[PDB]
Amino acid sequence: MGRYSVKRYKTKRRTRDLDLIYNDLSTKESVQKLLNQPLDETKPGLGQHYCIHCAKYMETAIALKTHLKGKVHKRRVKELRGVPYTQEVSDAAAGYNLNKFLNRVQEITQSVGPEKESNEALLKEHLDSTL
Amino acid sequence: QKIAKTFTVDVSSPTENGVFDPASYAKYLIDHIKVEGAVGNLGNAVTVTEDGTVVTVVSTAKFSGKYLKYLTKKYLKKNQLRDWIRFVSTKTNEYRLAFYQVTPEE
Amino acid sequence: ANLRTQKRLAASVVGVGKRKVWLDPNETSEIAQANSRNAIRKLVKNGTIVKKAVTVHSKSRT
Amino acid sequence: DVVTREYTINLHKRLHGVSFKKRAPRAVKEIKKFAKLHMGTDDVRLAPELNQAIWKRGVKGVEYRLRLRISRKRNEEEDAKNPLFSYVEPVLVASAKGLQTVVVEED
Amino acid sequence: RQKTMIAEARNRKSLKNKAIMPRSKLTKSFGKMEEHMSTLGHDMSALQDKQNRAARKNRYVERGSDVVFGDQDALTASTENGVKLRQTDRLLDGVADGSM
Amino acid sequence: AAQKSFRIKQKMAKAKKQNRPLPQWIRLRTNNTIRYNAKRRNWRRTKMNI
RNA sequence: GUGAACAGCCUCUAGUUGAUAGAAUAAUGUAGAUAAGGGAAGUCGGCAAAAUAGAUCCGUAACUUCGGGAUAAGGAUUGGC
RNA sequence: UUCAAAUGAGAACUUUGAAGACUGAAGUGGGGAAAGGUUCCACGUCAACAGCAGUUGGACGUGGGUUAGUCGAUCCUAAGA
Ligand SMILES: [Mg+2]
Ligand SMILES: [Mg+2]
Ligand SMILES: [Mg+2]
Ligand SMILES: [Mg+2]
Ligand SMILES: [Mg+2]
Ligand SMILES: [Mg+2]
Ligand SMILES: [Mg+2]
Ligand SMILES: [Mg+2]
Numbered sequence: 001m002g003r004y005s006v007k008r009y010k011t012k013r014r015t016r017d018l019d020l021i022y023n024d025l026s027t028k029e030s031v032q033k034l035l036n037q038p039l040d041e042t043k044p045g046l047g048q049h050y051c052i053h054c055a056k057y058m059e060t061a062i063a064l065k066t067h068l069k070g071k072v073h074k075r076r077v078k079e080l081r082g083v084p085y086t087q088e089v090s091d092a093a094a095g096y097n098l099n100k101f102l103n104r105v106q107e108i109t110q111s112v113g114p115e116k117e118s119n120e121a122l123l124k125e126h127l128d129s130t131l
Numbered sequence: 132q133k134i135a136k137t138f139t140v141d142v143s144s145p146t147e148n149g150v151f152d153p154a155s156y157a158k159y160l161i162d163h164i165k166v167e168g169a170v171g172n173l174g175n176a177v178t179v180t181e182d183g184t185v186v187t188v189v190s191t192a193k194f195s196g197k198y199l200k201y202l203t204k205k206y207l208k209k210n211q212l213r214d215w216i217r218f219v220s221t222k223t224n225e226y227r228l229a230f231y232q233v234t235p236e237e
Numbered sequence: 238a239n240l241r242t243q244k245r246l247a248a249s250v251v252g253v254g255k256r257k258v259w260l261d262p263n264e265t266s267e268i269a270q271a272n273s274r275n276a277i278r279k280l281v282k283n284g285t286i287v288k289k290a291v292t293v294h295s296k297s298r299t
Numbered sequence: 300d301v302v303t304r305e306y307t308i309n310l311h312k313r314l315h316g317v318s319f320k321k322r323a324p325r326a327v328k329e330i331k332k333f334a335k336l337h338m339g340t341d342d343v344r345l346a347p348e349l350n351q352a353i354w355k356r357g358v359k360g361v362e363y364r365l366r367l368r369i370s371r372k373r374n375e376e377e378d379a380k381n382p383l384f385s386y387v388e389p390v391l392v393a394s395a396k397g398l399q400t401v402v403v404e405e406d
Numbered sequence: 407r408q409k410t411m412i413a414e415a416r417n418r419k420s421l422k423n424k425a426i427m428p429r430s431k432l433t434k435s436f437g438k439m440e441e442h443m444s445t446l447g448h449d450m451s452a453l454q455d456k457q458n459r460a461a462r463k464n465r466y467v468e469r470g471s472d473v474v475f476g477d478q479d480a481l482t483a484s485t486e487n488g489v490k491l492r493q494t495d496r497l498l499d500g501v502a503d504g505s506m
Numbered sequence: 507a508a509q510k511s512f513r514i515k516q517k518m519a520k521a522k523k524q525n526r527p528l529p530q531w532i533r534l535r536t537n538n539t540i541r542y543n544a545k546r547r548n549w550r551r552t553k554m555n556i
Numbered sequence: 557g558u559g560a561a562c563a564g565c566c567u568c569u570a571g572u573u574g575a576u577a578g579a580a581u582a583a584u585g586u587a588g589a590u591a592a593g594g595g596a597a598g599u600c601g602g603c604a605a606a607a608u609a610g611a612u613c614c615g616u617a618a619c620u621u622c623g624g625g626a627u628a629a630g631g632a633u634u635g636g637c
Numbered sequence: 638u639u640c641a642a643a644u645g646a647g648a649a650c651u652u653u654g655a656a657g658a659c660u661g662a663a664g665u666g667g668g669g670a671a672a673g674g675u676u677c678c679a680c681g682u683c684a685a686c687a688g689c690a691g692u693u694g695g696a697c698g699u700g701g702g703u704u705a706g707u708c709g710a711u712c713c714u715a716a717g718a
């Protein structure tokens with residue numbers, strides 16, 4: 001309603017969703033594809049210097065490094081720590097598709113979660129080495 | 132350094148008018164005087180005694196008449212006597228409890 | 238009754254502002270008799286006129 | 300008829316939508332109208348301590364509810380046109396909510 | 407009772423705009439003293455005796471001025487310009503009698 | 507001005523002494539046609555112009 | 557006190573509380589605001605508003621009287637403990 | 638801006654008290670220079686004036702009040718006369 005919220009979260013100024021970013025980080029192939037992008041003229045930094053967590057392009061590697069050293073990036077990293085909150089959570093909290101939601105939570109805790117954590121560890125150490 | 136200081140309070144006017152208890156006042160001082168930041172730490176430092184008219188505090192470790200007045204006003208407030216009884220200094224380190232000015236009813 | 242002069246004289250005698258002087262609203266006739274600084278001093282001595290304390294500006298938060 | 304009662308006044312719905320500089324003065328006028336309604340007395344006198352309670356949070360911070368003690372007493376002066384008047388006092392309580400009208404015994 | 411005491415203290419105090427008057431400069435009444443001490447549950451025998459002594463000490467004894475001048479007033483013609491005895495009156499000093 | 511000249515103060519003294527209504531006994535004289543002071547001055551109405 | 561600050565905002569000493577009032581809350585005004593989707597299609601003309609703004613760091617073109625242009629432009633950030 | 642009392646024929650506007658606010662030390666504070674000339678202060682007091690009111694007033698009526706070897710003028714010279 002207020003002008004600040006309206007002009008920041010207007011639909012035409014929307015940002016990528018956290019479950020989508022979680023899926024981007026879960027698989028190694030997505031990580032490598034987002035790390036190594038073709039030279040695009042219309043992205044900042046020619047499509048390079050892309051932070052996957054924030055889904056954000058930086059103009060330069062020094063800009064990406066100063067961004068990684070920041071409370072904003074750490075806030076996003078903390079947000080991407082848990083279950084990505086699909087519609088299945090709301091359905092289960094209503095008491096509907098409970099077995100489906102529980103199976104999804106079990107899969108996150110067993111397979112998809114630790115693989116995402118290992119990919120994030122490898123990505124962070126690669127960024128430390130190259131920056 | 133740690134010279135013994137003596138402070139005395141005269142409670143005779145409220146005691147004789149029957150609105151004060153010197154023993155309770157002394158017990159409140161014993162239980163609430165702080166030494167190095169804690170209550171109940173009066174070991175061989177502060178001694179509080181009374182005989183029904185005069186309450187005597189003997190201290191060797193960080194005590195002042197301003198602190199004594201502060202504690203007395205707290206006790207009077209707790210007993211709802213703060214609106215009627217005040218703590219006055221007569222000579223240096225001797226004090227008394229005195230009523231405020233009251234007009235006769237007529 | 239008009240006690241404007243007595244209020245001004247009380248402020249001058251006590252040495253504070255006019256904002257700091259209390260005239261007893263029950264003793265209006267006695268205060269109205271007092272046309273000199275000497276009578277004002279007598280009223281201050283017996284308590285018909287009282288000096289108020291300063292409004293507190295604490296520095297605990299500072 | 301000399302009488303004393305305790306009432307609760309809902310100032311919230313009486314001050315709904317009033318300009319901020321006028322809220323507490325309108326509260327004074329509303330309480331006078333309330334006492335007139337409950338006691339039939341056009342002469343209503345508010346205690347200065349009640350006025351303090353109204354104005355306690357400034358010009359626009361009037362409480363939603365107030366507990367009043369209203370006394371209908373006799374006018375002793377011969378010059379007055381009304382033989383009865385109402386004196387409104389504040390009742391300082393833990394909360395002004397959930398209290399009903401009561402008759403205060405006179406001794 | 408604690409909530410009521412908070413409410414009464416809030417209605418009493420106005421410390422942001424001015425300081426509270428000093429009790430040592432104020433004076434109060436024995437009726438309020440008696441009712442408050444009775445609420446506290448003390449015995450009011452000694453205080454009542456002190457008040458009885460004070461009331462007996464404050465006696466009213468009339469004098470000759472009370473007999474003579476008590477209901478009278480004036481005893482001097484009120485001036486038309488509020489002047490003292492030897493103060494000139496520029497406007498009226500030339501007209502001796504009140505009819506003129 | 508606070509620091510004024512003696513000539514100015516002398517004129518001010520004359521003006522002060524002239525500032526008055528009629529004496530009442532002037533009205534009571536035979537054939538009196540003077541009924542008010544038609545040259546009365548006030549500090550906020552007509553300036554003296556030195 | 558905040559803060560670079562005789563800024564703005566709040567407070568102590570001191571000083572005021574003056575300026576016709578009361579009740580209602582139609583239109584039209586004067587002063588101030590917010591608005592989905594679009595984004596100058598409005599208009600003689602982006603008039604008016606909006607957007608920008610402090611500080612720290614990265615970085616900064618043509619042209620030039622070599623002194624400038626420059627806070628060019630463009631980016632990262634900012635609480636509390 | 639509000640409440641009670643007092644005064645008064647009469648009080649939104651006078652006085653005291655009770656409150657709520659404001660100037661916020663580049664003041665709505667405390668003094669002066671030019672100018673004014675009694676406006677200062679007390680007592681009395683409301684016809685007219687204070688674009689409402691008035692018991693109040695810088696209004697109306699009658700008085701009181703300005704004390705210097707050391708503060709100034711006075712003396713010196715300036716542009717000039
Ligand atoms: Mg509205
Ligand atoms: Mg829009
Ligand atoms: Mg066009
Ligand atoms: Mg067109
Ligand atoms: Mg340029
Ligand atoms: Mg302010
Ligand atoms: Mg302001
Ligand atoms: Mg005057």
Ligand SMILES: [Mg+2]
Nearest residue numbers: 687688689690
């Ligand atoms: Mg008029």
Ligand SMILES: [Mg+2]
Nearest residue numbers: 675696697698
């Ligand atoms: Mg005069």
Ligand SMILES: [Zn+2]
Nearest residue numbers: 051053054073
């Ligand atoms: Zn990031």
